[PDB]
């Protein structure tokens, strides 16, 4: 009998290549535009993943769009943290197999601070020694952890899906452990990490919003990312969105 976790493993997309061009000397604008082109393709991959995620299709189409538009940066930064953890133990930002940022390219304008923020996310995977299955369940919960303050169209369906994957995270914890000496402590630590992701990616999202709206900086965005940000941005800046937290603020 197939398990939900076994299905999360098989639907996880393969990692994308950048195609970045060595030949041009690096500039902050060129690098950020290259990263946004990669991000747009990773978001397309994430939409295909969400369509395959058991239960997601049960949601009203408008809620499917809301959840992807609200959570895309959390999904992308979490997966970047995982790749950087597995490929470098959190020492380098492993955007793609052909695009690694190490401390010496972080020195371009605007790159250092955002790169430190991305590395902190990877540093949490190292600190907690997160297992693949724990990561996969947590990543689903990120898709389900930012919602409109005034609710979703299919709220009861959403509540069912979210509780289902909360229990799946518990199952992933029990599989990681040899027995149960610290299953609650582990669940506490991982839900504290999920809660912290809202703040840990907030600076990335605000910088994304600035580079999107400030045409002066000449940072390019691909079409589907631009459409998503143009919808997400007014809702976030107006304070009409809320995180679903496990623990008291």
């Amino acid at each position: 009998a197939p398990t939900l976790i076994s299905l999360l493993e098989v639907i996880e997309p393969e990692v994308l290549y950048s195609g970045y061009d060595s030949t041009l000397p690096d500039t902050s604008t060129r690098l950020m535009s290259t990263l946004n082109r990669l991000g747009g393709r990773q978001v397309v991959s994430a939409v295909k993943w969400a369509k395959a995620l058991p239960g997601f299709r049960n949601l009203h189409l408008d809620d499917q769009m809301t959840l992807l538009q609200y959570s895309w940066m959390s999904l992308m930064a979490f997966s970047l943290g995982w790749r950087s953890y597995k490929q470098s133990n959190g020492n380098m930002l492993c955007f793609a197999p052909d695009l690694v940022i190490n401390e010496e390219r972080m020195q371009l304008p605007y790159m250092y601070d955002q790169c430190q923020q991305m590395l902190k996310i990877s540093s949490e995977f190292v600190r907690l020694q997160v297992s693949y299955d724990e990561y996969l369940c947590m990543k689903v919960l990120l898709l389900l952890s930012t919602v409109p303050k005034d609710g979703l169209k299919s709220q009861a369906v959403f509540d069912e899906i979210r509780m289902t994957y909360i229990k799946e995270l518990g199952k992933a914890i029990v599989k990681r452990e040899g027995n149960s000496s610290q299953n609650w402590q582990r669940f506490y630590q991982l839900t504290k990490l999920l809660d912290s992701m809202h703040e840990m990616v907030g600076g990335l999202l605000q910088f994304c919003f600035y580079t999107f709206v400030n045409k002066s900086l000449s940072v390019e965005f691909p079409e589907m990312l631009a459409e998503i940000i143009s919808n997400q941005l007014p809702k976030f800046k107006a304070g009409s969105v809320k995180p679903l937290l496990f623990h008291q603020k």
Binding site: V44, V47, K48, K51, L61, Q64, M65, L68, Q69, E223, M224, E227, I228
Partner: peptide, 10 residues
């Protein structure tokens, strides 16, 4: 909408 198109596509 590109996102909507993708969600509806096979």
């Amino acid at each position: 909408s590109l996102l909507k198109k993708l969600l509806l596509a096979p």
